[PDB]
Design an enzyme around this catalytic site. Structure first.
Site, mmCIF file in Angstrom:
data_model
loop_
_atom_site.group_PDB
_atom_site.id
_atom_site.type_symbol
_atom_site.label_atom_id
_atom_site.label_comp_id
_atom_site.label_asym_id
_atom_site.label_seq_id
_atom_site.Cartn_x
_atom_site.Cartn_y
_atom_site.Cartn_z
ATOM 1 N N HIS A 19 -7.070 -6.899 0.122
ATOM 2 C CA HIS A 19 -5.947 -5.972 0.008
ATOM 3 C C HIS A 19 -4.797 -6.330 0.943
ATOM 4 O O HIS A 19 -3.629 -6.068 0.623
ATOM 5 C CB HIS A 19 -6.476 -4.582 0.327
ATOM 6 N N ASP B 14 0.881 -1.192 0.000
ATOM 7 C CA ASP B 14 0.000 0.000 0.000
ATOM 8 C C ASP B 14 0.911 1.233 0.000
ATOM 9 O O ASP B 14 1.815 1.280 -0.838
ATOM 10 C CB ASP B 14 -0.978 -0.134 1.178
HETATM 11 CL CL LIG Z 1 -2.200 2.676 -1.641
#
Ligand SMILES: [Cl-]
Lengths: 297, 298
Positions: free
Chosen positions: B278, B108
């Site tokens: 994610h 991320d």
């Molecule tokens: Cl991100």
């Protein structure tokens, strides 16, 4: 404590099959409906409605679910807060007054009700004015990085409940004041009458009113966009004589003008920029009223 | 209470010209830096770090302004929270440990620091892994109605201060827990160790930490995008051997075949999906650890 900002106007609750519509009603002559948007109420017309009421019977209505109008129960497709449904509800309200053919001016969300009304039910309208908007389909087609940043609230307020509702509950006064100041030319609250800001603040203070607003933007992201997409794909144009006013410091200046855009949506449209941010009737009341009077006369 | 999720690992509080970097440090062997993202801290690596530490000297660092690292005052260009500046700061931190050439894996925001590091200073890296991202330029170039609705927080958190800070301040626990859950495969918090969630919640409870996160996303909308734009438009590619890993149900995929995107940005890149949302190192720790061990050991 809330100021009466419409000298000489009555106050009417109008019944419909989806709940009451609140309006201030003044004047005499041909009927003219005025529709506000976000994050406001009917009172945003308070600086231009008197000049209009010199010539017209002026009906200044709170949108379904906004201000003092009743809040219909929503559903999974946000149906009562789609512009198609809002237009049907306001057509019912106008019928209660005996108006089946009237003039219409809208600003922001209210202008989206207005052009959807013109597309769905053009026989209802003698003349149509829209203030500092493009069609919902066009703004979504324009949703690149620059627009995602400037028009972020179209996507933020459309997130699934309760995300925006939860965030808005901590400090509603700050958010409504930011959504008033941000697109004004001045960048602050100075263009607004403080008594009008208090109307907007009191409305936004109610969690049920904020939820309606989020349902409006959810509709704007989904059903309203699909409804507009059908008209684009069919080449349907509004046949109602139309006026598009916009703020020179409103809609980002770009490629086409807003008039170039509306001519793809309407076969008889004139337009003009106004020296103003987004909130034409409050930032530039004299110019806005003069343009509406000349157009509607 | 905050739990020790790297039992046996040491700690460093590393001075740099931009402020201290907190890290957990374990293992032995070739040096490997691990960088977390939003809204997390270094503890997101706690299920893969012990395995990596069997083979590498593992440095698990809090990004500038996150976790227990210092928070530099920002500026009008969000400079300290741009990935260019964060990468320079972490290069300084690694030099303090005597690491001038190292392996790097990021997730991320930390993955954005990592590929920017590879673009600006490729000689610092032996190998690079990026987890569940595309370049920031690619997220913005793709922007349209569906993406604006799907990944709204890039534009929301980049709004001018203090609007996001104001909104986040009423009930911060709710926002950080909703984001953690929203981006997992299942949509809840079951993939996370509850002690890890408490680390994330405690960091997010500090308004100064929340402001850093918004500055990070303001950089993401502005200078980071511009830095990326210069590189794509120049045809600059990362030369460092690279691994792109992404969740089948994560942010990066959406509508973009991630390896094909990364091949435009890197001349020696391999990649694979993992069945995960994610948060690859917490949702799929065994597969993520295996993929990283194999890539960095090769
Ligand atoms: Cl991100």
């Amino acid at each position: 404590d809330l100021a009466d900002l419409f000298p000489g106007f009555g106050s009417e609750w109008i019944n419909t099959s989806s709940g009451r519509i609140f309006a201030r009603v003044g004047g005499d002559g041909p009927p003219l409906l005025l529709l506000h948007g976000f994050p406001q109420t009917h009172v945003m017309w308070h600086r231009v409605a008197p000049k209009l009421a010199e010539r017209f019977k002026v009906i200044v209505a709170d949108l379904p679910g906004y201000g003092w109008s009743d809040m219909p129960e929503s559903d999974e497709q946000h149906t009562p807060y789609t512009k198609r449904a809002m237009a049907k509800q306001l057509i019912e309200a106008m019928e209660q007054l005996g108006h089946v053919h009237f003039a219409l001016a809208g600003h922001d969300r209210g202008a989206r009700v207005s052009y959807r009304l013109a597309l769905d039910s053009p026989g209802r309208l003698s003349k149509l004015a829209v203030l500092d908007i493009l069609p919902t389909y066009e703004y979504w087609q324009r949703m690149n990085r620059a627009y995602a940043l400037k028009i972020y609230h179209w996507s933020f307020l459309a997130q699934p409940a309760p995300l925006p509702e939860n965030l808005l509950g901590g400090d509603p006064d700050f958010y409504v004041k930011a959504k008033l100041a941000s697109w004004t030319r001045a960048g602050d609250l100075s263009a607004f009458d403080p008594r009008a800001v208090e109307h907007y603040r009191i409305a936004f203070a109610d969690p049920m009113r904020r939820h309606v607003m989020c349902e409006d933007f959810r509709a704007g992201a989904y059903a309203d966009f699909e409804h507009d997409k059908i008209d684009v794909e069919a080449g349907n144009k509004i046949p109602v004589p139309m006026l598009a006013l916009w703020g020179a410091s409103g809609i980002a200046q770009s490629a086409a003008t807003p008039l170039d855009v509306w001519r793809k949506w309407a076969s008889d449209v004139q337009g003009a920029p106004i020296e103003s941010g987004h909130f034409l009737p409050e930032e530039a009341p004299d110019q806005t009223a003069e343009a509406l009077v000349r157009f509607f006369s």
